[PDB]
Structure 1
Amino acid sequence: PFEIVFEGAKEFAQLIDTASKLIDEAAFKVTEDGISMRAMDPSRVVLIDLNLPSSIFSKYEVVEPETIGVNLDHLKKILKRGKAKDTLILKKGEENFLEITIQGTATRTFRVPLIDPELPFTAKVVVLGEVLKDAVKDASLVSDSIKFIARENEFIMKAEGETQEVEIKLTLEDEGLLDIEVQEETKSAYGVSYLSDMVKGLGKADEVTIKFGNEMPMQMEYYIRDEGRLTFLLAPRV
């Protein structure tokens, strides 16, 4: 059982929506420390790891820890009913139901039924969210895959298509590149469709840390409310 209060329903809705683009259903582990969730998309190409610490909730009361399963598609619809200034209350008792209350000008309570990484990276780059998002959109216009190239103090994203091509270079002098630590020239390619969903909802000024290796998965992480952690693991493109 628990009672968790989050200020800013819209923000929470956004997070869930992002997750729903890849995940249809998932189990949320609710502990005294926070809420965590891990799952893979249907194609088993993306792994998503979310952690929301109790510190981002205006009230976090967990009587006894518990894991709950929910349909994200159904969950998002309800959460999208909340506004930016609305407070969201998540409550769970004995029954297999989740009580979702949107409190604003009035109190609206929904009742929804509940259902039942150690990689040797050789490159780490920290870029601004705006840059990452633009790069992914540019690439989608030319190809279905985007190549990541990381060299000493240099980060490049390229996409090659039938007859078109796009390239985004970045150096320490650039405002988009905050940090870069490369042990050796690193390159690999990933599916643009996946990255599109991943960079969905991503802020403009938020810092995104990307780690990857030659022909190996990419790890992407950024924070929500500075404390919440959203980590993605994306397999390379065959």
Structure 2
Amino acid sequence: MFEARLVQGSILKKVLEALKDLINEACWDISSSGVNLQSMDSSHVSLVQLTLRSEGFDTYRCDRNLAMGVNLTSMSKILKCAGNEDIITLRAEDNADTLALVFEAPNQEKVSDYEMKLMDLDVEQLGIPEQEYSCVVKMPSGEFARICRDLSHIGDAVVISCAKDGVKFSASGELGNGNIKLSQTSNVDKEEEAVTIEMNEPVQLTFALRYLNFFTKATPLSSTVTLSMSADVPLVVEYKIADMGHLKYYLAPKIED
């Protein structure tokens, strides 16, 4: 008899639409400690992990752990039917047969509820290890989306190089060559626009820009995005949710010639 009441329901819609383009279906590792999602890319190149801590909900009542798996596209589609200021509460039975989505208007009697058909998926825990990264970049989400979408016209691949002074985004393609140099923010009062770069040794990796365009869909979730990267380890893109959790992304670097 799962029950989870969320006051700020608009977050869930942004969570789903950030995944529907990359992942079609996923298993929600629902536990009394919170909601967790970890699904891997269809082409097996990338990977996404999601964590929703139980303390962030208005009321969390996961009496027993669930391994619920839904369709991300279908779940997102219903979520557009929910207003940006409507209270959203998820509910599951004593057994995970159907998903009860409850949309409650903040100040009027209009109440909407939906039920979702479920899915059976054979998934396994994937060994995401915690390591220190030789390069950590903390830059505005909008700026990262701008850079990713700009170089997408240049070419399908982007070369990311970092130094102590700043980070350089380089690309090359059929219409020409271009590179964006972003120096570390010398002095800005708030990080929301500051570009914070922490690095140990110089790094240089190439990534497909199609996925990076997919990755940028989570920009509305948080004003700032953190990029973690090191030599011979996949790029790590994490969006810090407000007192709720994080949406961490993982993408293997492309092959150098």
TM-score by length of 1: 0.92
Task: Judge which range, 40-49 or 222-231, deviates more.
Answer: 222-231
Structure 1 residues 205 and 171, CA gap change in structure 2 (3 angstroms): farther
CA distance in 2, matches of 1:64, 1:27: 16
Q: Among residues 119, 127, 146, which one is paired with 2:158 in the alignment?
A: 146
In 1, are the aligned partners of 2:226 and 2:239 still within 8 Å (CA)?
yes
Find out whether 1:199 has 2:216 as its counterpart.
Answer: yes
Find out whether 1:170 has 2:182 as its counterpart.
Answer: yes
Unaligned segments of structure 1, at least 5 residues: none
1:228 equivalent in structure 2: 245
Q: Which has the higher strand share?
A: 1
Unaligned segments of structure 2, at least 5 residues: 121-127
Q: Deviations over 1:146-170 (max 9, x none)?
A: 1110112321111111242332212
Find out whether 1:237 has 2:254 as its counterpart.
Answer: yes
CA distance in 1, matches of 2:15, 2:104: 19
Q: What amino acid does structure 1 have at the position aligned with 2:99?
A: L
Find out whether 1:102 has 2:106 as its counterpart.
Answer: no
CA distance in 2, matches of 1:219, 1:40: 14
Q: 1:1-238 maps to which residues of 2 (within 5 A)? A: 1-95=1-95, 96-104=97-105, 105=108, 106-116=110-120, 117-118=128-129, 121-173=133-185, 176-203=193-220, 206-238=223-255
CA distance in 2, matches of 1:92, 1:101: 11
In 2, are the aligned partners of 1:171 and 1:177 still within 8 Å (CA)?
no
Give the count of matched residue pairs: 238
Structure 1 residues 163 and 51, CA gap change in structure 2 (3 angstroms): same
Displacement after TM superposition at 1:215 (Å): 4.6
Secondary structure of the 1:130 match is: helix
CA distance in 2, matches of 1:183, 1:147: 19
CA distance in 2, matches of 1:216, 1:28: 26
Displacement after TM superposition at 1:9 (Å): 2.8
CA distance in 1, matches of 2:244, 2:104: 24
Secondary structure of the 1:27 match is: strand
Structure 1 residues 180 and 44, CA gap change in structure 2 (3 angstroms): same
CA distance in 2, matches of 1:171, 1:27: 40
State the percentage of identical aligned residues: 24
In 2, are the aligned partners of 1:187 and 1:215 still within 8 Å (CA)?
no
Displacement after TM superposition at 1:56 (Å): 2.4
Displacement after TM superposition at 1:11 (Å): 2.4
Q: What amino acid does structure 1 have at the position aligned with 2:56?
A: I
CA distance in 2, matches of 1:110, 1:156: 47
Q: What amino acid does structure 2 have at the position aligned with 1:148?
A: I
Structure 1 residues 166 and 215, CA gap change in structure 2 (3 angstroms): farther
